[PDB]
Design a protein around this ligand. Sequence first.
Ligand SMILES: CC(C)C[C@@H]1NC(=O)[C@H]([C@@H](C)CCO)NC1=O
Ligand SMILES: CC(C)C[C@@H]1NC(=O)[C@H]([C@@H](C)CCO)NC1=O
Ligand SMILES: O=C(O)CCC(=O)C(=O)O
Ligand SMILES: O=C(O)CCC(=O)C(=O)O
Ligand SMILES: [Cl-]
Ligand SMILES: [Fe+2]
Ligand SMILES: [Fe+2]
Lengths: 289, 287
Amino acid sequence: TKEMTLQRARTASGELVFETGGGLSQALQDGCFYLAIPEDIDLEPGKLLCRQFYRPAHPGSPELRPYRGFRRNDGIYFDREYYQTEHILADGPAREKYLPPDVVALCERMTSLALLVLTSTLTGLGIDEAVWEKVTGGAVGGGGTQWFAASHYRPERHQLGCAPHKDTGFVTVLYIEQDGLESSVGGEWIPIAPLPGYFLVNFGGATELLTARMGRPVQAILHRVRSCVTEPAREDRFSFAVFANPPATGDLYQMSESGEPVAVRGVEEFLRDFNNETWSDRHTDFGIT
Amino acid sequence: EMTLQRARTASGELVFETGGGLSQALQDGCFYLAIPEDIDLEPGKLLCRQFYRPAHPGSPELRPYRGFRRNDGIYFDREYYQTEHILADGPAREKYLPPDVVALCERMTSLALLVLTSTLTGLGIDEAVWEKVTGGAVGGGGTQWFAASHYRPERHQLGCAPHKDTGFVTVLYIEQDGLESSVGGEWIPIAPLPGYFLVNFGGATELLTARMGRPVQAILHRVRSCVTEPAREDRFSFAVFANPPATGDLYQMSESGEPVAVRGVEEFLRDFNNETWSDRHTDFGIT
Ligand SMILES: CC(C)C[C@@H]1NC(=O)[C@H]([C@@H](C)CCO)NC1=O
Ligand SMILES: CC(C)C[C@@H]1NC(=O)[C@H]([C@@H](C)CCO)NC1=O
Ligand SMILES: O=C(O)CCC(=O)C(=O)O
Ligand SMILES: O=C(O)CCC(=O)C(=O)O
Ligand SMILES: [Cl-]
Ligand SMILES: [Fe+2]
Ligand SMILES: [Fe+2]
């Protein structure tokens, strides 16, 4: 199966500019697109954490020490019983408390790109700016919950890489380097290829619910990581991503066809249903508290 | 465990024993239905204890209840889950299952249709549109599925993938603990109640009623990992489902009460399979 042919965008003076002809219209219909990584970003702190977080703090250099030992942190480390993936998931405060400052710096840059995509999309959908803070639970302006994930795919386990899921928030900005990610398009798993120098952007369940009654609804793509098999001298698969989410204590909104925001359900119960159908393991507070 | 409504049969009417009645059952998305006293459940329990066994060794009487792991059309060995199951529509049951089992399935399917018509009536949906929005399932058409599930305890996995049933109405037989439902975000066990089927609704009922005054939800459920052996036998279950045909469209009652086709059934089912099972049986419940 051939990979998806997605739109490609770049940021130019804080505006989203599309290099491919379909533009933001086609990208929203696809539910995902590639976003050029701003040339000044150093990705190496994120890759370093993805290569080290699951290793013991000792033995090893004192320089790598703040990048290791995270399997001990019950607050932000998640060993998945049924999948190859183990991952850090940390909100803003948790990143500043537990992750190296160069990683925190990288997350802040990725978060700004996620917010840029969010405001571009809301504008593209003709949603009144006056309701942006309310319908995003504050996420649009850097509030809400700004999640970070660092994933390591453990090849020694004969399991699927990542549970099939829809992301739960508004916008995801994802870094990948290896094959393995797939999306459900028309009922068939289509690979999403890594594009060097680009993030992958998609939308989450909160954007799907928000726009489900509009003229051009935006979908949250259903995606998984297939079982990862080691290729000699190729490193284990990893990924890292930031997500702009509504806070778990609030409500999810949906635009009525008359253009009015309606609070339709609580975020926390939505996330709990998500955890139950996606992971179904002991980490029942994952992404909530 | 949940405190569900209980109903029993009475001349082709659904009669509720408990005070919440049909209204509360539709709110819960599930309830217990008394098994008609004349029904023999043993053909179903027998198939559930035999279908995964080799044709031989064993008695010639049990042979038609065995050897289904070689039937590529109706047998599904799950990679990531303890469950292995038969899934057969009407014709396949006719063609591959013992008549005693086909007869029990017909009796369960009739109950599923009784529930479906009681639910469409209780929601005030016009009877003139029943055949259109159910793809013929309300009157015994569409696709009437049967599942026979065996939970392999030697597999150290979840018992059953968490899922919402895909159709309109499910009638399920269980005898052992293990089944759980997601209520208010928490996994709550659904206990086996002797002499009762479990009834719930599927994605098609949820989508159909999502924008009415009293939407009916399709309960999210799973089967925990089944602990290996000691004395008790392996867990099993069997059930029938009234589904829209894969070739049709899923409908939804509008704000004004008129049916609108919102998406195709097959693409709905393929998405379901991809997120629920995510294995090679990509035509499960479609072909
Ligand atoms: C694969 C995993 C690491 C991330 C995955 N994607 C999501 O968007 C959410 C995160 C943001 C938590 C909030 O729900 N949940 C998930 O499971
Ligand atoms: C657990 C399995 C045996 C049955 C389970 N429940 C459903 O309703 C459907 C069936 C009816 C097939 C059509 O989708 N799919 C499922 O996976
Ligand atoms: O690792 C991947 O490619 C997918 C990661 C992902 O889906 C997520 O973090 O939510
Ligand atoms: O085995 C059970 O208890 C549930 C089975 C089920 O959910 C199904 O067949 O759809
Ligand atoms: Cl239900
Ligand atoms: Fe994801
Ligand atoms: Fe089910």
